[PDB]
Every structure is written in structure tokens, then in C-alpha cells.
Amino acid sequence: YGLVTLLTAGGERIFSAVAFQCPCSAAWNLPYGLVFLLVPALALFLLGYVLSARTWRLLTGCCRGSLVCTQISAAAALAPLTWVAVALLGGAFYECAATGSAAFAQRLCLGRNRSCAAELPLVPCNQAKASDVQDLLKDLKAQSQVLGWILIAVVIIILLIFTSVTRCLSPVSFLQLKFWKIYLEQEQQILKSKATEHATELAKENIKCFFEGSHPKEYNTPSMKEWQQISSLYTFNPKGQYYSMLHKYVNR
Amino acid sequence: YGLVTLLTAGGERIFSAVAFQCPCSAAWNLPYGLVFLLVPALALFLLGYVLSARTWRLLTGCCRGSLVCTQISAAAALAPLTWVAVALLGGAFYECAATGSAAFAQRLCLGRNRSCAAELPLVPCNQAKASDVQDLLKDLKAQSQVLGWILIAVVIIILLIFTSVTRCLSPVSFLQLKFWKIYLEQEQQILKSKATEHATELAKENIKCFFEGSHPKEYNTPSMKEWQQISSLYTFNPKGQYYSMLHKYVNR
Amino acid sequence: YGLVTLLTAGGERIFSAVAFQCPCSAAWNLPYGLVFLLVPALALFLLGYVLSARTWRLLTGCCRGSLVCTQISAAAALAPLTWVAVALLGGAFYECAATGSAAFAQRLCLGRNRSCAAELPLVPCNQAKASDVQDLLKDLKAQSQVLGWILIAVVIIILLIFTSVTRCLSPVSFLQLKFWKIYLEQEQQILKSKATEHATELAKENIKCFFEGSHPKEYNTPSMKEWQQISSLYTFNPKGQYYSMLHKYVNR
Amino acid sequence: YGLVTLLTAGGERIFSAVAFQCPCSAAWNLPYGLVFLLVPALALFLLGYVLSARTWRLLTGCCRGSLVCTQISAAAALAPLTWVAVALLGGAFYECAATGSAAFAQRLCLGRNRSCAAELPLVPCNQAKASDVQDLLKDLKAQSQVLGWILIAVVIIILLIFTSVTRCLSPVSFLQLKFWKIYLEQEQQILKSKATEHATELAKENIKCFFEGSHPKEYNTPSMKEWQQISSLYTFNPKGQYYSMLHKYVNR
Amino acid sequence: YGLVTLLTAGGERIFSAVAFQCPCSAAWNLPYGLVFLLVPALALFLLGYVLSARTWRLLTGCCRGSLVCTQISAAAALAPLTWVAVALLGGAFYECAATGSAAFAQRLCLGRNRSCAAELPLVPCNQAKASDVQDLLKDLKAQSQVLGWILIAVVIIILLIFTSVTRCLSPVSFLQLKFWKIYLEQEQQILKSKATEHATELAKENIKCFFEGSHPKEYNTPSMKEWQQISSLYTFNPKGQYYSMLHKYVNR
Amino acid sequence: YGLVTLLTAGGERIFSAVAFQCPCSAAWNLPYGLVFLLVPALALFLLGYVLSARTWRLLTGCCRGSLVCTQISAAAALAPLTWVAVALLGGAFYECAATGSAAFAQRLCLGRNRSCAAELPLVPCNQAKASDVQDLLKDLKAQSQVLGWILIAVVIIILLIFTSVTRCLSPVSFLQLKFWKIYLEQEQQILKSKATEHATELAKENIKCFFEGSHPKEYNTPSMKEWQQISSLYTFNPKGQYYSMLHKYVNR
Amino acid sequence: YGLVTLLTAGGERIFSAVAFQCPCSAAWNLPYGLVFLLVPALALFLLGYVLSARTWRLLTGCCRGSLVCTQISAAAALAPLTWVAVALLGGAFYECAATGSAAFAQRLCLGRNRSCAAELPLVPCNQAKASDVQDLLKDLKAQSQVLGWILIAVVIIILLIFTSVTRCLSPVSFLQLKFWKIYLEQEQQILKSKATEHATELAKENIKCFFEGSHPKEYNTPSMKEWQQISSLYTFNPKGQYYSMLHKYVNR
Amino acid sequence: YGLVTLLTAGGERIFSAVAFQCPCSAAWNLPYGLVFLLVPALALFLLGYVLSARTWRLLTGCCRGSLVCTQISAAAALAPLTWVAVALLGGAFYECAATGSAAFAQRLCLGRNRSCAAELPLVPCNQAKASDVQDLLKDLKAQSQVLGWILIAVVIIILLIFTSVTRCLSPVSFLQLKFWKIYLEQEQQILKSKATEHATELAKENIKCFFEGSHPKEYNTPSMKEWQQISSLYTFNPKGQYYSMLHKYVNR
């Protein structure tokens, strides 16, 4: 129960701390909204850019490259766009971003109170009492939510076009591509299991030879150059089907 | 319990954020309603346009085509129409769409207050106090719900006509069409299972040959050109019944 | 629990949205009631017209016909009449339909307030304060419920006459008709099961021949023309009892 | 139940005691915030600097060294930065750090009340009633949260660059590095188990010889110089793959 | 349930009795705080100084000695420092220690009320009403908590330096030291078990000889001088590895 | 449930009866506090002096003796000191003991009201309204709690010195003393069991001889003089290790 | 549930009836307290004097005797003293016994109101309003509780001295006395069991002989004079150890 | 559940009906208390006088006799005395018996109001308002409870003397008397069982002979004169031990 209690206490403290006041300030407010917009989005973007093993496969070993790079970048930027869309649909962040540069304010307000730019930042702060801005905060909330929805539409549209073109111009058919992906999945799982047990037997043999203090068996050597040879990325040629470059490397 | 708590917290935050205020604004309100109408509808339409594997079957491989295209487009536009119908029956969105172009307003209001177009947008906002518009908001809600019901009738009618004609002019009978669909289902499931285990054995053999470092077996080759040959779409000719083009490709 | 919570939230939202206000409007109210009367009724009528496989049996294959058509139409119009009866017994819809054409109003009200047609639509809206109409709304509710009960009587009467005549003039006896229906039920279930397993074996054989890449077995061919031949509808002649046209087609 | 009750009582007492008042004091407040910033951060930094066995491996035995040292220092400073980021996002600590050196105050306040530096420390204390500082506390809270978010961005960026470069310039490939780490894991677990049972048998033999009072068996001797020889750190040379220096020491 | 009820009643009585009032007294208050500071700390220090069996091993038998003594003293003073740190972070004790010697008071208060030393002791007592001291109590609470945090930092720093130096200059490597500690653990457990059963058999034999009234067996004698010989402490020499002096005493 | 209900009722009655009012009386109050101090302490002291079987071993049989006597007296006075310490830390008892002899009062009060000794006993009674004594009761509570803490420190210190010296000057080593105590424990348990079954067989034989009415078996006689011989206390001589005097008595 | 309900109802009625009002009466109150003091104490004393089988062993058979008589009397008066101590610590009874003989009152009250003896009995009755006695009731409660505690100390002291002397001058040692008591326990249990089954077989034989109507077996006769012979009490002589007089009677 | 509900309803009705009002009446009240005193006591006395089978053993058969009669009468009057003691300790009954004969009243009241006998019966009725009797009711309650306690002491004393004398002058010893009572218990249980099965076999034989309609077996006859012979009561003579007169009747 200790873990449960500590986790609930930590979560409550965390959320009470992420309380979003949108401080009404003449000039220090814009960055307040801007960081709450960009930084968590950038964070999730980075985590996506990190997590996928496909890019790591390319990166290791002392560092056409455009296609794979834009593919991985989009496949990772999927999620941060979802976060920023959800936040922008939250409305609070952009509502705080209302002020921004003075150009936005001067172009923005209808000029009714003639005192917009002076103490506009008070408008999400609810401290200003001019009727014009008390209605204008609502319109700004609207612009935030609307922009968010427009973004979540643009992102799905881009995903459509991306996946469709990537699915349109490939030489291989569909019912084989599905089977190929199943193949790669099975290969990954089999590799995990058998490499695990092979490393296990290697360790067992070596540690027994250490306790005894004698020569090892010298059963076989997984060649490191071979490892690099099978780490190739592209895995296609119309003639030599040979998926999974390891499999391509069975002729010699 | 952590997943459960995080999911309920996220759902509550999400729904509190999708709170729909319908900001009363002279000109920025129309798009507010318009995005809440179109964008989620377009989203679900796109997801339908993506999900079905029948269209993907046509799309892959470097891209009569009308019939299949309108069939898939309608079969996917089924759901977005359901969303937009439910929303329009919600009444709030179109109620916010009341203003729209000025032509709608000038033609719309009875001319009683003579001040409609000035601050009509306040009518779902409940801030306007003219009796005429306080009753007119109700009629607009009515028009929304009624239009929604009319749409959900038109959509079912269209579905009827579509499925009836598609069921009327086909050469094959009913009790055979049912059996054929059962056939295709069984074929899909069998294909999934056996292709899975065949890829499994392929991977096993190749990974064993890799650990040993020797020549593979060369059992057999699923031909890629054969894969493309069996990916055909139409699957009918009165003479050569031969469902499931794979099955058609058993004579040679 | 996620499915349960989402379903209850959706149901609550749906029902809160189907809230029926009956907007009091001089001319736009009649259609408000009319759609809530007809459209859900038409919807359930259409779903009935779709669901029964007996009509589909007739429809497929490039399209005396009166008897079967009126039979299926009544057997499907059973349910929509139940919906419209329940709704009309609800009273709200027709109460909203009070206004209708002006002829209904002028003939309807006793002429007491002499101001009926002007703002009668307010009478279910409870905003009108003339004593005559405040009592007249009740009578309209009465007319709605009464008409509903009259309809639910007429529908059961029609069902009686229909099923009795259909049960009266048939040549076959009762205790055999029951057995015949049991027969058709058993035939349907047996057909489902055995056709399922036969398609299963067909698929197995063909997919094995594909993995191997060799000629199929050519066990037998369910003839498509035979399928159409056994799809006939009438299934009766006094001499050749031969229920279930498939069974009739065993002499040659 | 005694342990549970004592733990909940202790936790409640602990948290009630860590109550953070931010005493408003002219000069003794700055250190109040500074210790609550640095000391828990330094504590978690130290615990990280202690816990990892990789550094201990280097440290023991009477004490190129730069690379490993910066690697371990960053890998341990990961967590304290997370603590300080969470705290700075809490806002209270830095809000208490508002005062700091007088330079911060004189540069900070807009000069409105002209009495900032006199009793500014009261501003998180809520005792000062000047409007300027009552709004300025909010901006200070903002600066705290914003700086926190900037730090949590900088830390993830640094983690990215660190892990990417460390993953970029290594000679070995990826799919082999994963296998190598699995290898080291298996080696650690096998070592734990077998060393455990070997020490067990050693102890059993010696304690039996003690109860009897006779000469021991002298089965074998794990050489201490050998232990030191196998404690090496680098474990790489392009030619002699020989992971896990113990494994490198199997040729002689 | 009796034990449970008596324990909860005793705990409630105990805690209600340890209620800390900090009596405001001119001269008798300082010791009030001082005992609540030192005595529980000294108590836990003593319990640590008692509990560890390593020191007892040295102490028994009619009583270089510096190194082991400072090691055990620090290893035992670990916990009392934790208690005193937690208490000092509680703030109440030192807040009561505010008064102390008059030098602390005269140097302490800003000289505002000019009546500090007269009735300062009332300041945690909340009975004094001078504004200066009502704010000064807060600063004293601050000094308490801050000093506590400084102490909990100094203690962890000292622990770091201690364990690092003790881990730095030892001749044996790490991966062998871990194994050695595992060895000593296994030896302790084996000793417990086998000594237990050996004493059991000894007692059985002697008590049987008593019931019968005859001569004992005289199986063997665990020599007391041998016991003292195997009780040695240092257990290291670079040449004769021979951990666990018992094990060192197997050559003769 | 009857036992449970009677026990809870008895406990509630008991505790409601041990309600401590500290009657404010000029001369009869001192003994009121004194008995509540000494008598329960003396009671637990006596129970300790009774319970230990080591002293009984010395006492029986018609009654160097200093060492064992002070050892047992301290080992039994352990607990009463804990009771009196807990009570004195309760504060109420000594607070009632405030009055005591007049010397304590005259030396005690600052002489402010000049009416201390007259009606000081009212000070824990809360009936006196002089400000001096209303503050003095608090200081007396302080003196009680402080004295209690001083006592609980002195007792642990004495326990330390006692157990350390007793552990310091003994000739036998530690790791043998532990084994010896385990030995005595096992001997006690074995003695309990086997003496039990031997008395059981004795009783069985004699009662069978009684039912039959014949001569007994005369198997053996546990000699009473032997019993006294094996009841000796010291159990040590450097030469004849011979723990557990019974065991010492196996040579003849 | 009937037994449970009747028992709780009876207990509630019983306790509501034992409500102790201490009627304030000039002369009839003293006996009111005196009976509530003595009678339940005498009752429990008598029950103790009855229950122990050791005295019954002496009493039966037509009735040095001092030692056993004082031993049994003290061993039985143990409990009544506990009851009277608990009651006297309750305070109510003796508080009611305040009045007693007039000598107690005249010596008791300080002579302040000069009207003590007239209506002192009202003092626990709370009806008298003289300040002196309203404080004097408290002192009387004190005297009651204090006397109770003094008694519970005297009783434990007496128990100590009694059991110590009885344990001091006995000729037999301790470790044999424990074994002897275990012996007597086992003898009692064995006697219970075997006498039970022997009476069972006797009854079986006789009742079978009755149903048949024939001569009995005449197996054996437990001699009544033998029964009396084995009922002796002292069970000790230094020479003939022979515990449990039955066992002493095995020589002839 | 029906039995449970009916029992609780009956119990509630019964107890609500046994509500004891003690009607304040000048002359009809005395019997009100007297019946509530004697009648339930007499009832339980009678039930005791009935239940014991020892007296029935004497009574049957056409009706020294003093000793057994007083023994049974006391053994049965045990319980009614307990009831009357509990009731008298209840106080209400005797409080109602306050009035009694006028002699009790005239001797009873102090003569203060000079109006005792007129409307004294109102004193437990709480309707009289004279201070003297409002205090006198309390004293009467006291006399009731005290008399009850005196009675419960006298009864236990009498039980003591009775059982002691009956245990003192008997010729047989204790340890044989216990065995004898065990014997009689076993004899009763064996008699129950075997007589049961013997009557069972008798009935079986006779009812079989009835169904068949033939002569019975005539196995044996339990003689009625024998039954009377074995029903004797005294069961003792010093010479012929022969407990359980049935057992005495085994010589002839």
C-alpha cells in the first residue's frame, strides 16, 4: 500500500503544482504561454525521435538519406502534434498567448476602449472590466480552439497523404507486404529468444571455465563484421527479394 | 490502478476542455460553428477512407475504376454522416451557425426588433434581451434538430437504394453469395494462420543457419510476381466461377 | 470498465440531446412535430424492409409478385407502426402537431379567446395564458393518446385478419405446417454448419496447394447455375410436396 | 497492522513538518529558498553518484579517465535535475528566492511603489498590500515555472545529444550492442547464482572441517590477483572482441 | 483483538502525552528544548552503538584500535543524526531553543521593541504581542528548518566521503568484495543452522545419559581456546587470503 | 461474543475509573501524586523480581551472592523504571506532586502573588486565577516531562554500562557465548519435552498398577539429591568448560 | 439468535439495575456503602474458598492443620482482595462511606461551614452547596482511590512474601518441583481418562447382566478403604520421595 | 425467517406488556408489589421442585424421609432465591412495596411533612412534591438493593454450609466420590442407549408378528417387580459398596 499511497500523493502534488494561472503581465506573459505551448510538445517530439529503433539502426557506427530521414521524422512528430493539438484545444495556453507581439494586439482589438494595449494582458486574468475585452477573451478562446481543430485536421490530412503515397508507389503488393511485416515481427521475436539462450549458454560455459580455471571450448564466433553486414537498412531489390538483410546474406 | 486513474483523469480533462461555449461574436462565430461541424466529420470520414483494406488492395503497386471507387467512398462515408447527424441533432453547433452569412440573417429574422443583424450573434449567448430573438433561438434549435433528422433519413434512404441495387443486379444468387462471403472469411483466417506459421518456420531456418554460419535449405520461394498476380480485385466471370483470384489461379 | 463508462456517458449525452422542447413557433413548429413523427418511424420501417432475408431472396439476380410483396411489406411494417403508436401515445409529438395547417386550428378552437390562430403555437409552450387554450392543450394531449390507442388497435386487428386469412386458405394442414417450419429451421442450421466446414476444407486444400505451388485436387464443383436453381421461392405444388426447393430438386 | 499504522502516522507527521511557509524576512529568506532548492537536489545527485556500480568498479583498489567520469557524472546527474525541475515548476521555492541579492530586486521591480526593497520580502508572504507587488508575486511565480520548464527542456536536449553521440561514434553495430547488453545481463545473473552456491559449498566444507577438527579439502583457489585482473573496465578492442574482460581472459 | 485494542489505546495515550507545548519560561525553557533535542538523539545513538555485533566481537574477552573504533562509531551514529535532523526540520524544538543563553537573544533581535530579553520566551508561546517578535518566531522556525537541512546535507556528504575512501584504498577488488560479503553471509547462516543442530544433539545425548544415569559418549570437544582463536577481527593479509579467520585457521 | 463483550465493558469501566482528577487539596494532594508515582512502579518492579526463574533457582532450598543479586535486581528493575519514566513523561503525576513539602513551594514560586503556599494546590486544578501560577503549572509540567526524559536517558546509560562491563570482562569469547545460550535454550526445551513424557510413562505405569492392584515395575529413580546437585548456579571454571551443571556432572 | 438476544437484554437490565446512586441520607447511607464494599467481596472470597479441590480433599470424611489452612485461605482470598481493590479504586463506594460513624465526620471536616455533620451526607449527592464540602468530596474520592492503591500494593507485597517463603524453605529443588507439578498434572489427566473408561466398562458389564438377568463377572474391586488410603494430603518425606500418595502406596 | 420474525415480535410485545408502572394507590399498591415479588419467585421454585428426577424417583409408586426432602427442597430453592435476589436488587418491586402495612409507613417516615400516610403511595409515582418523600424514595430504593445484596449473601452462605456439611460427614472419600458420580453418569447414558435399542428390537419383533399374524418370540421379560426393586434410593452401606442399586442387585 506504500507504493500506492506515495503515487497518489505525488500525483496530487504534481497536478496541484501544474496549476495554470496565466499571470496577467504586460510583457512577461507571452513567454509564459509560449513555453507551455512549445516545451512539452518539443519534449514529446524528442521522445518520439529517440524511441524508434529504426533510426538508431541508421545512426550507430560512425554515422538517399533524405527519404528515410523525413519518414522517421514524420513518424515521430505524429505524437507531439497530438499533444499540441490537445493543448491548443484546451484554449488556456493560446488564450494566454493573446498578447504576443504588440502587432497582434493593435491589429486584434476593435479599438473600442482605445485602451487595449495598456492593460489588455488582464483579459484572461479577469481583472480588466472593459466590456469590449471581457467579450474579446471569449473570441480569443474561440480562436484557440478553432486553430487547434484546424491543426488536428491538417495533421490527419498529412498522415493520409503520407501513408497513401508510401502505400501507392511501392512495387510489392499488399497481401505480401502484410506477410512481410508478420515475417519481420516473427524474426524479431525469434531473434530475441534464441539470442537470449545463446548468450546464456556462452556465459555458462565461460563462467564454468573460470571457476575451474581452464581453457574454454571455442564453439563458434558470431563475427562482428558479420553483425555490421547484417545491420543494413534498405532491404529491397526487385530481383533478390531477400527481406531482412540477414536473410539476404544467405547466398555467400 | 495507475492506468485506470490516469485514464479517468484524462477523460475528465478532455471533456471539460471540449466544453462548447459558442462565443457570441459578430463575425468570428460562423467559423466557430463551421469547424465543429466539418472537422470531426471530415476526420471520421478520413478514418473510414483509410481503414478498409479493400481500397488499399487497389491502391498499392504504382496506383471500371469508378464503380469500385464510389462503392468504397460510400461505404466509408457511412460513419461521418452518422457523426454529423448526431451533432446536428445536438442542435448546439448549428445554433451557433445561426449567423452565417448576412444573407441568412436578413432573410431569417422577421424584422421585429429591426436590430437583428447588429447583435443577433448574442442570441445563443443569451445576452440579447429582445423578445423576438429570445424566441428565435428556439426556432433555430428546431431547424438544427429537424435538419439532422432529415439527414439521418436521407442517409438511410441512400443506404437502402445502394445496397438494394447492388443486391439486385448481381448475377449470382443470394444463398450462394452468403456462402461466398463465408468462404472469403475462412480464407482470410486460414491465410493468417498458415502464413504466420510458414513465416515462423522460414525465420527459424534462417536464424539457425545464421547462428551456425552455413548455407540455408532453399525449401521453396513464394514468388513476388505470383503475389501480385493473386492480388487482383474483380474476382468474377460468369464462366470461370473461381472466387478469390488466388483460387482462380489454380489452372496454370 | 472503459467500454462501460464510455457507453453510459454516450447514452446520457444522447438522451440529454434528444430532449424534446417542442419550440412554440407560428409556422416552423408543424414540421418539428412532423419529423419526430415520421422519420424514426420511417427509419424502423426501412430497417424492417431490409433485415428479412425472404425479400432479399427475391431481389437478387437482375430483379404473382404482388402477394409476396404485400406479405413482406406488412411483415416489415409491423414494427414501425409499433414505434409510431408508442410515440403517439407519448402525446408530446402530436401535441406539438396541434397547429398543423391553419384549417386544423380554425376548425379546432371553440372561438373563445378569438385569438387562437395568432399565438396558439404557445399552447404546449405554456407561455400563452388564455384559459381556453390552457385547457385545450390537455384535450390535444387526449386526442394524441386516443389516436395512438386507436392505431394500436387497428394494427392488431389488421395483424389478426392477415394471419388468419393466410392461415385459413392454405391447402396444407396445421400440424404439418408446424413440422414444415421446423424442417426449414433444421435445414438452415445444417446448411450453415456443413457449408461452413465444406468451405473450410476447400480453403485448406487450395491454400496448401498454394504454399506448395502445385495442382489442386478438383474434388467437386458446387454449380452456380445449380445454386440459382435452388434459390426459387414458392416451394409448393399439391402433387410434388417437395418443400425447400433444394429438396424439390432431387428427382433429376 | 502496527507497521501500517506507524508508517501512515510517520508520513503524516513528516509531511506536516515539511510544510513550506516561506518566512518573509529581509535577509534570512534568500537562504531559506536556496537550501530548499539545492540541498535535496544535491542529495539525490549524491545518491545517484553513489548507487551505480560502474563507478565503484573504477574506484576500488587504490584509486582516458575523463570520458568515463563525465559519462557516469551525467548518468547520475540525470535524476537531481529532475527533482530540481519539478521543484522549480512547483514555483514556491523560487518565489521565495525572489529577493536574493539586492541587485535582483532593484533591477526587478518597476519602481512603482518606490518602496520595493524595503519590504518586498513580504510579497509571497501576502502581508504587503501595494498593488504593484501583489501583481509582481504572480510574475515571479511565472518566472519560476517558466525557468523550470526551460530546464526540463535543456536536460532532455542534453540527454538526446549525449545518448546520440554515444550511439553514433561507436564502432560496433546496434543489433550486436543489444545482444552484448543482454549478454552482460545474463553474465551478471549467472555470476550471482553460481558464485552464491560456490561460496555456499566452500562454507559448508570449512564448517564441517571445523566441527570435526581436521584438514580441509583444498579443492581450488579463486585467485585474488585473477579477481583484480578480471575487474578491468574498458572491454573493447576492434580485433579481440572479447566482451566482459573475464571473457577476454580465456586465451591464457 | 485484545492485543490490538491495548496497543492502539497505548499508542494514543503515548502520543497525547508526548504533546509538545514548549512552555514559555524565562530560564527553564532552554533545557526544555535541549533535552528534546539531545536525549532521543543520544538514545538512538546508544542503541546503534549497542546493536552491531562487530563491536561486541572486539569488546568481549577482557577488552590499530582507532580505525575500527571510528568506523563502528560512524556506522552507529548514522541513525541518531537522522533523528536529530528530522526533529530539527520539525522546527518546534529549536524554535523552543530560541532563547538559549542571553548572548543569543541580545545578538539575535533587531532591537526594535527594546524589550526582547524581558519576555522573548513568549514568542513561540504566542502570548507576546510585539510585532517584531511575532515575525521573529517565523525567522527562528526558518533557522531551525534550514539548519536541519544543512545537517542532513553534511551527514550525507560525510557518508559519501567515508564510504568512498573505505572503498578506494582497499587492496581487494570490487567484484571479489561483493563475493566475500556473500561468503560471510552464507557462513553466518550455515553456522547458525549447524551449530543449532549440533547443540541439539549434544543436549539430547546428555539428557538421555541423565535419565538413564550413565556415562556420556564423549564424541568431541569444541575447544574454547579454539573459539577464542577463531574470534579474531582483522581477517586480511595480502598473501594468505583466508577470509573469515575460522577459514584462515585451516592450515594447522 | 460474551467474553468479548464482557472484556470491553470491563476495560471501559476500568479506564473510566482510573480517571485522574488530581484533587486540589492543601495537604492530602502530595500523597495522591506520590502513590500514583510509586505504587504501580513498585508493582511492576515486584512482578519482575518474581517472574525470572534465575533468582528462584537461587532461592529454593533453605535459602559471591552480591554479584548475582545485583544482576537480577537490575534485570528486573528494568521495566518499573520504564513505567515510571512513561508516567513522569505523562506529566500529570508530577504536576500533582508540585506541592510536596512546603520547602518545594517556598523555593519554587517567584514570590509574585505572595499567596503561593496558601492556595497553590489549585494550580493543576485550574481554579486559582493568579496569572503567576497559571503560567507556573506549565513550567511544572515541563519539569515533569524533562525529568522523565532525563530518567529514561539515565536508565539506558546504566543499561549500556551494565551490559558492556558484563560483556567486557568475561573470559569466554562472543561467538561461543551465543552458541552457549543457544545450547541452554535447546537444553531447556528438550528437558521440558522429555521430562514431560517420562512423567507421563511413570504415571501410566503406576496408575495401571493401581487399577490392577499389584507391584510396580521399579524401572529407575531420578535421585532427589541428584536433582539438588544439578541445580547449581555458577556453571563456570576455566578448565572444566562443562556448561549447564547437569552437563558438568557427567564425569562421575 | 434467541440466546444472544436474551443475554444482551438481561445484561442491559442487570447493569441498569446495578446503577449506583449513593442515596444521600443522614444515617442509612453508611450501610449502603458498607454492603457494596463487603458483600461482593465476601461473595468472591467464598467462591474462592469453595472452588479449590485441595481444601475439599482435606474436608471430606468426618472432618499441622494450621499451615495448610492458612495456605488455602490466602490462595482463595487472593481474588476478593482484587475485587475490593478495584472497587475502592472506583472511588464511589468509599465516597459513599464518607459519613460512616460521626467520629469520622467530626475529625474529618475542617470546621469551615460549621454545618458539616448536619447535612454532610449530601456531599456525594451534589445537593449541598457549601464550598468547603464541594471541595471535600474530591478529597474523599482521593482518599478512596489512594487507599485502594495502597491495598493493591499491600496485597502484592503479601503475595510476594508468601510465595517466596514457601519457595525458600522447601527441601526439594526448583527444577524438580516443576517436574513434580507436571507429574501431578499428568496424573490428574490420566486418572480422569482411565477412570472414565473403567467406569464405562463397569457400567456396560452390569447393564448387560441386567438386560440378560444373570450373574455379573466380578472382575475386580476398587477398594473403598484403599480410596481413603490414597486420599492423603501431605505427600512428602525426605527418604521416601514417593509423590502423589497413590504412588507412595506401591510398596505394599 | 417467519419463526424469527414471529419470535422477535412476540418478545417485543411481551416486554412492552411487562412494563412496570407501580401504580400509586393508597391500598391496592402493596399487593401490586407483593405479587411481582412472590409469584415469579414461586414459579421458578416450583419449576425447580418439578424438574429434578431425584425427587420423582422417591415420589412414584403410591408415595429418614426428612434428610432427602430437605436436600431436594434446598437444591430446588437455589434458583428462585436467585430470581428474587435479582429482582430485589432491581429495586423497583420493593420500592413499590414501600407502603405495605401502615405500621411500616408510620414507623418509616421521619414525620417531617406530617402528611406521609395520606399520599405516601405517590412517592415512587413521582407525583408527590414534598421534599421529604422525594428524598425518601431514594432511601427506599437503597433499602431494596441492600436487602437484595444481603439476601444474595445469605443464600451463598447457606449453600456453603450445606455443601460443606454434606461433603464433611460422608464416609466415602473425595477421589472416590468423583469417580462414583462419573460412574452414575456413564450408567445413565448407557442405560438410555441400550434401553432405547432394546425397546426398538422389541417393537420390531412385535410389529412383524402383527403384520404376519403369528406368535411372538418370547425372548425375555424385564420384570416389573425387578424394575421396582432397582428403583431404590439410598444406595449405600459401608460393607456392600454396591453403588447404583441395580448394581447392588447382582448377588441374587
Author numbering:
A (entry chain A), B (entry chain B), C (entry chain C), D (entry chain K), E (entry chain J), F (entry chain I), ...: 20 to 82, 94 to 282
The article reads:
In humans, the CALHM family encompasses six paralogs, some of which function as non-selective channels that are permeable to large substances such as ATP. The CALHM subunits thus constitute unique modular building blocks that assemble with different stoichiometries into large membrane channels. In contrast to previously described CALHM structures, where the oligomeric state of individual channels was described as uniform, our data show heterogeneous populations with CALHM4 and CALHM6 assembling as decameric and undecameric channels with similar abundance and CALHM2 as predominantly undecameric proteins with a smaller population of dodecamers. Despite the unknown activating stimuli, our study has provided insight into gating transitions of CALHM channels by showing two conformations with either a cylindrical pore of uniform large dimeter within the membrane that is constricted at the intracellular side as in case of CALHM4 and a conical pore that continuously narrows from its extracellular entry towards the cytoplasm as in case of CALHM6.
Unlike CALHM4, there is no dimerization of CALHM6 channels and the C-terminal region following the cytoplasmic helix CTH instead appears to engage in intramolecular interactions with the outside of the cytoplasmic rim for most of its length. Whereas in the cylindrical pore conformation of CALHM4, TM1 tightly interacts with TM3, which is a part of a densely packed outer rim of the pore consisting of TM2-4, the helix has dissociated from its interaction site and instead moved towards the symmetry axis to alter the pore geometry in the conical conformation of CALHM6. In a superposition of the subunits, similar conformations are observed for α-helices TM2 and 4 and the C-terminal helix CTH and larger differences in the interacting helices TM1 and 3. These differences are most pronounced for TM1, which in CALHM6 has detached from TM3 and moved by 60° towards the pore axis around a hinge located upstream of a conserved phenylalanine at the end of TM1.
